[PDB]
Design a protein around this ligand. Sequence first.
Ligand SMILES: Cc1cc2nc3c(=O)[nH]c(=O)nc-3n(C[C@H](O)[C@H](O)[C@H](O)COP(=O)(O)OP(=O)(O)OC[C@H]3O[C@@H](n4cnc5c(N)ncnc54)[C@H](O)[C@@H]3O)c2cc1C
Lengths: 32, 46
Amino acid sequence: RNYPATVHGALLSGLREAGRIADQFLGAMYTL
Amino acid sequence: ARTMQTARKSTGGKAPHRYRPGTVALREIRRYQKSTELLIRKLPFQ
Ligand SMILES: Cc1cc2nc3c(=O)[nH]c(=O)nc-3n(C[C@H](O)[C@H](O)[C@H](O)COP(=O)(O)OP(=O)(O)OC[C@H]3O[C@@H](n4cnc5c(N)ncnc54)[C@H](O)[C@@H]3O)c2cc1C
């Protein structure tokens, strides 16, 4: 949302979804 | 948006009460010019 149609925007979206998937399928040990 | 403008960046859109001296004096002038009561005290005068 904050950086659309840019390179850094897609870069952060990749980091975002990679963190979303890892917390989903590997578990989050930092939230406890 | 404007984040893609590399040249010729478009800058259009974003960034108590006191009375004045002399008033009470004149009002006193109006007050005593209408009355006729004595102004000097009676006992100090006597
Ligand atoms: C003309 C132009 C100029 C740009 N200029 C700038 C600029 O000055 N600064 C800036 O920061 N950003 C700029 N960008 C944006 C930048 O290019 C993008 O952010 C980035 O390159 C694309 O990232 P992405 O991986 O999300 O998209 P993509 O890399 O397009 O991700 C889609 C990928 O999937 C593939 N694919 C597509 N269809 C299929 C299919 N059916 N099956 C399998 N694979 C498929 C594609 O080949 C591609 O590899 C520009 C983009 C364009 C088009």
